[PDB]
Amino acid sequence: PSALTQPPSASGSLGQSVTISCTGTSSDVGGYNYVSWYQQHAGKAPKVIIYEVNKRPSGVPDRFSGSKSGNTASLTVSGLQAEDEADYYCSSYEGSDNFVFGTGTKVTVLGQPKANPTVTLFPPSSEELQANKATLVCLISDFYPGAVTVAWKADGSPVKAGVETTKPSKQSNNKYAASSYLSLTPEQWKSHRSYSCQVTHEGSTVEKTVAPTECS
Amino acid sequence: PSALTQPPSASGSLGQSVTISCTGTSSDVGGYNYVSWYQQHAGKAPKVIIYEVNKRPSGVPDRFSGSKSGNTASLTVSGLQAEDEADYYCSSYEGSDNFVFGTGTKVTVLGQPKANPTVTLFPPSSEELQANKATLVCLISDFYPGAVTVAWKADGSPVKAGVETTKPSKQSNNKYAASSYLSLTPEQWKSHRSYSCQVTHEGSTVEKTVAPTECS
Amino acid sequence: QXXX
């Protein structure tokens, strides 16, 4: 197991070529080849489109191609069509029960200008600290395509624990909102210098940072 | 061409069991011991919970069960866990390097307990204020089932302006999170006594307030 | 999983 690093969104104007990456960690996508790509049309099931790094299955179209330099595999759609909108997924068959899957990439044919998110990070309020609770929130809004990667960092070091992130929910302005949160012990809150909400969206990652003070 | 035949929906009572069948052909499910069952939770990545008919990956649920008959493979989830709510797809080898996929099941866990939402209201961040913006977040977390009504107030009067509310998304504890945000000028914020977030759920209404009464 |  693990997850293989894919990019959040991967969008093109009807016509261009687009490259999706899957960057693995030695073990699985790292010098070893059962690297396969699946297409996940909105609501239907996966269709494998490229087996074994560059080979494609019966009935897949030539404009799809695969490649793998070292720790990264690639798929390239050359001649982006409407029906190329789907999510793509990579994976690696190690040598056993646990074949690893990648993160997913929303390929989007662009219908408006691209929007890079407005990341806003909020500290645990004083009232909440009152009740002896602490929740941080990372508001991610006004972005398009509607797919991002959130990530957390406690005092520099990445954080897995108290975290949840919502699906992109298209606002009234058809740009998207999403949010992520970290709940903790107040002492946990005081056990660190700083916290970061770090978001990946196409070309730009943005990492925002909070810190504990002592207002009341 | 065609696919593998699965049922939409297959809900067990919590604690009991659910079986998902996958019916195919003499050429696929009916001709090889390569039947693969996948999970894939709402919005996350597909996960192999069963390879080769009846083989689990190492740390897979000890009572995820695989069984071929003829052209029919069967996954038995025993000990219906809430976290089992997901889509389930089957797949089969299908001659000369192909691999066909099942239509996909939605599995539900009948009898999950209701949970009224935690409502965390956050005021204009310190920082953001420097940058001359104000954004309130209303975090609606840990509710079940997946429906809420957020309405905001300014001194007990509806605000239809600059509020935006994410659809709810399941969290790792299969309850839901969601957010509502209100964009204001520091003028607005500092000129209105209290903003309220009113989260209505299952006939219950919890309302949180916030005042420009934060040291600074 | 290859499998295959």
Side-chain angles (χ1 to χ4, degrees), chain A residues 154-183:
Chain A
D155 210 15
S157 207
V159 161
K160 251 284 206 50
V163 182
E164 314 285 339
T165 288
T166 83
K167 271 29 265 191
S169 269
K170 193 173 255 272
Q171 305 172 176
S172 48
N173 70 322
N174 305 132
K175 259 123 82 189
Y176 298 56
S179 57
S180 186
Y181 68 80
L182 224 188
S183 351

PDB file of all heavy atoms in Angstrom, chain A residues 154-183:
ATOM      1  N   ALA A 154       2.131  20.157  11.060  1.00  0.00           N
ATOM      2  CA  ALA A 154       2.318  20.644  12.428  1.00  0.00           C
ATOM      3  C   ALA A 154       3.789  21.062  12.584  1.00  0.00           C
ATOM      4  O   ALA A 154       4.717  20.267  12.453  1.00  0.00           O
ATOM      5  CB  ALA A 154       1.922  19.659  13.494  1.00  0.00           C
ATOM      6  N   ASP A 155       3.937  22.344  12.798  1.00  0.00           N
ATOM      7  CA  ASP A 155       5.203  22.981  13.161  1.00  0.00           C
ATOM      8  C   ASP A 155       6.326  22.578  12.218  1.00  0.00           C
ATOM      9  O   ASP A 155       7.492  22.402  12.634  1.00  0.00           O
ATOM     10  CB  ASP A 155       5.453  22.638  14.644  1.00  0.00           C
ATOM     11  CG  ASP A 155       6.245  23.707  15.369  1.00  0.00           C
ATOM     12  OD1 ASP A 155       6.354  24.818  14.810  1.00  0.00           O
ATOM     13  OD2 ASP A 155       6.752  23.440  16.465  1.00  0.00           O
ATOM     14  N   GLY A 156       5.966  22.432  10.948  1.00  0.00           N
ATOM     15  CA  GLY A 156       6.882  22.006   9.897  1.00  0.00           C
ATOM     16  C   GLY A 156       6.665  20.580   9.442  1.00  0.00           C
ATOM     17  O   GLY A 156       6.727  20.319   8.214  1.00  0.00           O
ATOM     18  N   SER A 157       6.421  19.662  10.360  1.00  0.00           N
ATOM     19  CA  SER A 157       6.266  18.229  10.062  1.00  0.00           C
ATOM     20  C   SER A 157       4.824  17.873   9.711  1.00  0.00           C
ATOM     21  O   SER A 157       3.870  18.229  10.414  1.00  0.00           O
ATOM     22  CB  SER A 157       6.765  17.350  11.204  1.00  0.00           C
ATOM     23  OG  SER A 157       7.196  16.073  10.734  1.00  0.00           O
ATOM     24  N   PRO A 158       4.692  17.126   8.624  1.00  0.00           N
ATOM     25  CA  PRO A 158       3.388  16.820   8.019  1.00  0.00           C
ATOM     26  C   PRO A 158       2.489  16.089   8.996  1.00  0.00           C
ATOM     27  O   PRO A 158       3.006  15.312   9.818  1.00  0.00           O
ATOM     28  CB  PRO A 158       3.714  15.981   6.801  1.00  0.00           C
ATOM     29  CG  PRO A 158       5.123  15.483   7.057  1.00  0.00           C
ATOM     30  CD  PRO A 158       5.804  16.652   7.767  1.00  0.00           C
ATOM     31  N   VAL A 159       1.178  16.326   8.847  1.00  0.00           N
ATOM     32  CA  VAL A 159       0.207  15.792   9.819  1.00  0.00           C
ATOM     33  C   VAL A 159      -0.932  15.054   9.150  1.00  0.00           C
ATOM     34  O   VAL A 159      -1.689  15.621   8.349  1.00  0.00           O
ATOM     35  CB  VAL A 159      -0.255  16.934  10.748  1.00  0.00           C
ATOM     36  CG1 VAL A 159      -1.552  16.645  11.475  1.00  0.00           C
ATOM     37  CG2 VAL A 159       0.831  17.246  11.757  1.00  0.00           C
ATOM     38  N   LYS A 160      -1.103  13.804   9.558  1.00  0.00           N
ATOM     39  CA  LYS A 160      -2.120  12.880   9.105  1.00  0.00           C
ATOM     40  C   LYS A 160      -3.379  12.831   9.966  1.00  0.00           C
ATOM     41  O   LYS A 160      -4.509  12.691   9.454  1.00  0.00           O
ATOM     42  CB  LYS A 160      -1.544  11.450   9.088  1.00  0.00           C
ATOM     43  CG  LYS A 160      -1.312  10.909   7.688  1.00  0.00           C
ATOM     44  CD  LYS A 160      -2.624  10.495   7.020  1.00  0.00           C
ATOM     45  CE  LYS A 160      -2.351   9.414   5.975  1.00  0.00           C
ATOM     46  NZ  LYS A 160      -1.521   8.334   6.565  1.00  0.00           N
ATOM     47  N   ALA A 161      -3.186  12.924  11.265  1.00  0.00           N
ATOM     48  CA  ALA A 161      -4.194  12.670  12.280  1.00  0.00           C
ATOM     49  C   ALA A 161      -5.509  13.395  12.126  1.00  0.00           C
ATOM     50  O   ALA A 161      -6.353  12.983  11.288  1.00  0.00           O
ATOM     51  CB  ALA A 161      -3.618  12.882  13.684  1.00  0.00           C
ATOM     52  N   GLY A 162      -5.759  14.433  12.913  1.00  0.00           N
ATOM     53  CA  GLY A 162      -7.123  14.948  13.103  1.00  0.00           C
ATOM     54  C   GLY A 162      -7.725  15.640  11.914  1.00  0.00           C
ATOM     55  O   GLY A 162      -8.438  16.659  12.142  1.00  0.00           O
ATOM     56  N   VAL A 163      -7.587  15.124  10.697  1.00  0.00           N
ATOM     57  CA  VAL A 163      -7.924  15.884   9.494  1.00  0.00           C
ATOM     58  C   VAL A 163      -9.053  15.342   8.632  1.00  0.00           C
ATOM     59  O   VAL A 163      -9.077  14.137   8.364  1.00  0.00           O
ATOM     60  CB  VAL A 163      -6.634  16.053   8.632  1.00  0.00           C
ATOM     61  CG1 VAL A 163      -6.949  16.888   7.398  1.00  0.00           C
ATOM     62  CG2 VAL A 163      -5.489  16.606   9.447  1.00  0.00           C
ATOM     63  N   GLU A 164      -9.902  16.268   8.145  1.00  0.00           N
ATOM     64  CA  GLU A 164     -10.885  15.923   7.099  1.00  0.00           C
ATOM     65  C   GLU A 164     -11.004  17.044   6.061  1.00  0.00           C
ATOM     66  O   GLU A 164     -11.003  18.230   6.416  1.00  0.00           O
ATOM     67  CB  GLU A 164     -12.287  15.672   7.590  1.00  0.00           C
ATOM     68  CG  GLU A 164     -12.582  14.822   8.790  1.00  0.00           C
ATOM     69  CD  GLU A 164     -12.480  13.337   8.663  1.00  0.00           C
ATOM     70  OE1 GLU A 164     -12.529  12.709   7.628  1.00  0.00           O
ATOM     71  OE2 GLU A 164     -12.338  12.779   9.773  1.00  0.00           O
ATOM     72  N   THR A 165     -11.166  16.648   4.808  1.00  0.00           N
ATOM     73  CA  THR A 165     -11.335  17.542   3.672  1.00  0.00           C
ATOM     74  C   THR A 165     -12.584  17.191   2.857  1.00  0.00           C
ATOM     75  O   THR A 165     -12.807  16.010   2.538  1.00  0.00           O
ATOM     76  CB  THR A 165     -10.079  17.541   2.719  1.00  0.00           C
ATOM     77  OG1 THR A 165      -9.018  18.238   3.429  1.00  0.00           O
ATOM     78  CG2 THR A 165     -10.351  18.177   1.356  1.00  0.00           C
ATOM     79  N   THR A 166     -13.337  18.217   2.499  1.00  0.00           N
ATOM     80  CA  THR A 166     -14.576  18.049   1.732  1.00  0.00           C
ATOM     81  C   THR A 166     -14.286  17.977   0.243  1.00  0.00           C
ATOM     82  O   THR A 166     -13.177  18.296  -0.225  1.00  0.00           O
ATOM     83  CB  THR A 166     -15.642  19.143   2.112  1.00  0.00           C
ATOM     84  OG1 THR A 166     -15.360  20.354   1.363  1.00  0.00           O
ATOM     85  CG2 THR A 166     -15.685  19.436   3.623  1.00  0.00           C
ATOM     86  N   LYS A 167     -15.268  17.496  -0.493  1.00  0.00           N
ATOM     87  CA  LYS A 167     -15.235  17.479  -1.970  1.00  0.00           C
ATOM     88  C   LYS A 167     -15.487  18.924  -2.405  1.00  0.00           C
ATOM     89  O   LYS A 167     -16.227  19.646  -1.709  1.00  0.00           O
ATOM     90  CB  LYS A 167     -16.324  16.591  -2.544  1.00  0.00           C
ATOM     91  CG  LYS A 167     -16.061  15.121  -2.775  1.00  0.00           C
ATOM     92  CD  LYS A 167     -15.036  14.485  -1.842  1.00  0.00           C
ATOM     93  CE  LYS A 167     -13.649  14.474  -2.475  1.00  0.00           C
ATOM     94  NZ  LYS A 167     -12.710  13.625  -1.693  1.00  0.00           N
ATOM     95  N   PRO A 168     -14.864  19.301  -3.497  1.00  0.00           N
ATOM     96  CA  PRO A 168     -15.164  20.575  -4.160  1.00  0.00           C
ATOM     97  C   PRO A 168     -16.662  20.668  -4.409  1.00  0.00           C
ATOM     98  O   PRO A 168     -17.256  19.769  -5.023  1.00  0.00           O
ATOM     99  CB  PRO A 168     -14.338  20.549  -5.425  1.00  0.00           C
ATOM    100  CG  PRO A 168     -13.771  19.175  -5.540  1.00  0.00           C
ATOM    101  CD  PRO A 168     -13.671  18.672  -4.094  1.00  0.00           C
ATOM    102  N   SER A 169     -17.241  21.733  -3.896  1.00  0.00           N
ATOM    103  CA  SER A 169     -18.627  22.126  -4.095  1.00  0.00           C
ATOM    104  C   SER A 169     -18.716  23.507  -4.762  1.00  0.00           C
ATOM    105  O   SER A 169     -18.462  24.563  -4.172  1.00  0.00           O
ATOM    106  CB  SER A 169     -19.424  22.127  -2.813  1.00  0.00           C
ATOM    107  OG  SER A 169     -20.017  20.860  -2.635  1.00  0.00           O
ATOM    108  N   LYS A 170     -19.070  23.414  -6.027  1.00  0.00           N
ATOM    109  CA  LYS A 170     -19.266  24.526  -6.942  1.00  0.00           C
ATOM    110  C   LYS A 170     -20.222  25.538  -6.317  1.00  0.00           C
ATOM    111  O   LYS A 170     -21.347  25.180  -5.963  1.00  0.00           O
ATOM    112  CB  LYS A 170     -19.859  24.041  -8.267  1.00  0.00           C
ATOM    113  CG  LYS A 170     -19.816  25.066  -9.396  1.00  0.00           C
ATOM    114  CD  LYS A 170     -20.262  24.471 -10.720  1.00  0.00           C
ATOM    115  CE  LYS A 170     -19.110  24.213 -11.677  1.00  0.00           C
ATOM    116  NZ  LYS A 170     -18.831  25.419 -12.512  1.00  0.00           N
ATOM    117  N   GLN A 171     -19.733  26.747  -6.193  1.00  0.00           N
ATOM    118  CA  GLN A 171     -20.467  27.870  -5.609  1.00  0.00           C
ATOM    119  C   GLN A 171     -21.519  28.320  -6.616  1.00  0.00           C
ATOM    120  O   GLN A 171     -21.693  27.696  -7.687  1.00  0.00           O
ATOM    121  CB  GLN A 171     -19.515  29.027  -5.254  1.00  0.00           C
ATOM    122  CG  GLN A 171     -18.395  28.622  -4.349  1.00  0.00           C
ATOM    123  CD  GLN A 171     -17.277  29.550  -4.048  1.00  0.00           C
ATOM    124  OE1 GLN A 171     -16.382  29.220  -3.239  1.00  0.00           O
ATOM    125  NE2 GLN A 171     -17.201  30.735  -4.644  1.00  0.00           N
ATOM    126  N   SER A 172     -22.171  29.407  -6.280  1.00  0.00           N
ATOM    127  CA  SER A 172     -23.155  30.050  -7.155  1.00  0.00           C
ATOM    128  C   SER A 172     -22.459  30.671  -8.362  1.00  0.00           C
ATOM    129  O   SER A 172     -23.132  30.962  -9.372  1.00  0.00           O
ATOM    130  CB  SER A 172     -23.891  31.131  -6.364  1.00  0.00           C
ATOM    131  OG  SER A 172     -22.925  31.933  -5.679  1.00  0.00           O
ATOM    132  N   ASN A 173     -21.161  30.913  -8.214  1.00  0.00           N
ATOM    133  CA  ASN A 173     -20.371  31.526  -9.287  1.00  0.00           C
ATOM    134  C   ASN A 173     -19.592  30.467 -10.056  1.00  0.00           C
ATOM    135  O   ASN A 173     -18.672  30.816 -10.817  1.00  0.00           O
ATOM    136  CB  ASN A 173     -19.504  32.674  -8.793  1.00  0.00           C
ATOM    137  CG  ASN A 173     -18.345  32.288  -7.914  1.00  0.00           C
ATOM    138  OD1 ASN A 173     -18.481  31.371  -7.091  1.00  0.00           O
ATOM    139  ND2 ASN A 173     -17.204  32.959  -8.031  1.00  0.00           N
ATOM    140  N   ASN A 174     -19.942  29.224  -9.856  1.00  0.00           N
ATOM    141  CA  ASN A 174     -19.388  28.106 -10.638  1.00  0.00           C
ATOM    142  C   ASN A 174     -17.888  27.934 -10.433  1.00  0.00           C
ATOM    143  O   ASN A 174     -17.275  27.022 -11.032  1.00  0.00           O
ATOM    144  CB  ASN A 174     -19.785  28.263 -12.110  1.00  0.00           C
ATOM    145  CG  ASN A 174     -21.284  28.399 -12.286  1.00  0.00           C
ATOM    146  OD1 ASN A 174     -21.743  29.295 -13.008  1.00  0.00           O
ATOM    147  ND2 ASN A 174     -22.078  27.561 -11.623  1.00  0.00           N
ATOM    148  N   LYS A 175     -17.316  28.817  -9.644  1.00  0.00           N
ATOM    149  CA  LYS A 175     -15.978  28.545  -9.037  1.00  0.00           C
ATOM    150  C   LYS A 175     -16.270  27.707  -7.807  1.00  0.00           C
ATOM    151  O   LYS A 175     -17.463  27.724  -7.386  1.00  0.00           O
ATOM    152  CB  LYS A 175     -15.271  29.850  -8.787  1.00  0.00           C
ATOM    153  CG  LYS A 175     -14.233  30.149  -9.876  1.00  0.00           C
ATOM    154  CD  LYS A 175     -14.445  31.457 -10.570  1.00  0.00           C
ATOM    155  CE  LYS A 175     -13.888  32.637  -9.806  1.00  0.00           C
ATOM    156  NZ  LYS A 175     -14.328  33.904 -10.432  1.00  0.00           N
ATOM    157  N   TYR A 176     -15.314  26.982  -7.256  1.00  0.00           N
ATOM    158  CA  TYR A 176     -15.556  26.023  -6.191  1.00  0.00           C
ATOM    159  C   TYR A 176     -15.036  26.365  -4.796  1.00  0.00           C
ATOM    160  O   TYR A 176     -14.004  27.005  -4.592  1.00  0.00           O
ATOM    161  CB  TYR A 176     -14.961  24.640  -6.517  1.00  0.00           C
ATOM    162  CG  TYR A 176     -15.508  23.952  -7.727  1.00  0.00           C
ATOM    163  CD1 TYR A 176     -15.477  24.565  -8.982  1.00  0.00           C
ATOM    164  CD2 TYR A 176     -16.031  22.671  -7.636  1.00  0.00           C
ATOM    165  CE1 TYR A 176     -15.965  23.916 -10.117  1.00  0.00           C
ATOM    166  CE2 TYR A 176     -16.512  22.004  -8.753  1.00  0.00           C
ATOM    167  CZ  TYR A 176     -16.469  22.623  -9.988  1.00  0.00           C
ATOM    168  OH  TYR A 176     -16.935  21.943 -11.072  1.00  0.00           O
ATOM    169  N   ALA A 177     -15.779  25.771  -3.841  1.00  0.00           N
ATOM    170  CA  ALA A 177     -15.384  25.844  -2.424  1.00  0.00           C
ATOM    171  C   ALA A 177     -15.084  24.419  -1.969  1.00  0.00           C
ATOM    172  O   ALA A 177     -15.596  23.455  -2.555  1.00  0.00           O
ATOM    173  CB  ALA A 177     -16.455  26.480  -1.580  1.00  0.00           C
ATOM    174  N   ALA A 178     -14.252  24.329  -0.970  1.00  0.00           N
ATOM    175  CA  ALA A 178     -13.885  23.071  -0.298  1.00  0.00           C
ATOM    176  C   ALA A 178     -13.267  23.502   1.028  1.00  0.00           C
ATOM    177  O   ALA A 178     -12.813  24.673   1.057  1.00  0.00           O
ATOM    178  CB  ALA A 178     -12.908  22.298  -1.154  1.00  0.00           C
ATOM    179  N   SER A 179     -13.281  22.678   2.035  1.00  0.00           N
ATOM    180  CA  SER A 179     -12.640  23.033   3.312  1.00  0.00           C
ATOM    181  C   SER A 179     -12.079  21.768   3.960  1.00  0.00           C
ATOM    182  O   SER A 179     -12.431  20.650   3.589  1.00  0.00           O
ATOM    183  CB  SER A 179     -13.489  23.815   4.271  1.00  0.00           C
ATOM    184  OG  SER A 179     -14.714  23.236   4.643  1.00  0.00           O
ATOM    185  N   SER A 180     -11.183  22.046   4.884  1.00  0.00           N
ATOM    186  CA  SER A 180     -10.419  20.955   5.559  1.00  0.00           C
ATOM    187  C   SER A 180     -10.264  21.401   7.007  1.00  0.00           C
ATOM    188  O   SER A 180     -10.222  22.636   7.215  1.00  0.00           O
ATOM    189  CB  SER A 180      -9.080  20.764   4.877  1.00  0.00           C
ATOM    190  OG  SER A 180      -8.354  19.661   5.373  1.00  0.00           O
ATOM    191  N   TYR A 181     -10.199  20.462   7.921  1.00  0.00           N
ATOM    192  CA  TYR A 181     -10.148  20.785   9.337  1.00  0.00           C
ATOM    193  C   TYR A 181      -9.351  19.758  10.155  1.00  0.00           C
ATOM    194  O   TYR A 181      -9.253  18.566   9.873  1.00  0.00           O
ATOM    195  CB  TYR A 181     -11.492  20.985  10.025  1.00  0.00           C
ATOM    196  CG  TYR A 181     -12.426  19.820  10.216  1.00  0.00           C
ATOM    197  CD1 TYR A 181     -12.288  18.892  11.235  1.00  0.00           C
ATOM    198  CD2 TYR A 181     -13.540  19.693   9.370  1.00  0.00           C
ATOM    199  CE1 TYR A 181     -13.206  17.853  11.398  1.00  0.00           C
ATOM    200  CE2 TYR A 181     -14.466  18.673   9.515  1.00  0.00           C
ATOM    201  CZ  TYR A 181     -14.297  17.759  10.535  1.00  0.00           C
ATOM    202  OH  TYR A 181     -15.243  16.779  10.681  1.00  0.00           O
ATOM    203  N   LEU A 182      -8.911  20.395  11.249  1.00  0.00           N
ATOM    204  CA  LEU A 182      -8.021  19.671  12.201  1.00  0.00           C
ATOM    205  C   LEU A 182      -8.590  19.993  13.581  1.00  0.00           C
ATOM    206  O   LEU A 182      -8.697  21.184  13.905  1.00  0.00           O
ATOM    207  CB  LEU A 182      -6.641  20.215  11.939  1.00  0.00           C
ATOM    208  CG  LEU A 182      -5.468  19.289  11.843  1.00  0.00           C
ATOM    209  CD1 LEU A 182      -4.185  20.130  11.780  1.00  0.00           C
ATOM    210  CD2 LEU A 182      -5.445  18.359  13.041  1.00  0.00           C
ATOM    211  N   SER A 183      -8.959  18.969  14.291  1.00  0.00           N
ATOM    212  CA  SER A 183      -9.497  19.087  15.654  1.00  0.00           C
ATOM    213  C   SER A 183      -8.396  18.565  16.572  1.00  0.00           C
ATOM    214  O   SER A 183      -7.738  17.586  16.171  1.00  0.00           O
ATOM    215  CB  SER A 183     -10.752  18.252  15.799  1.00  0.00           C
ATOM    216  OG  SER A 183     -11.182  17.743  14.547  1.00  0.00           O
TER     217      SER A 183
END
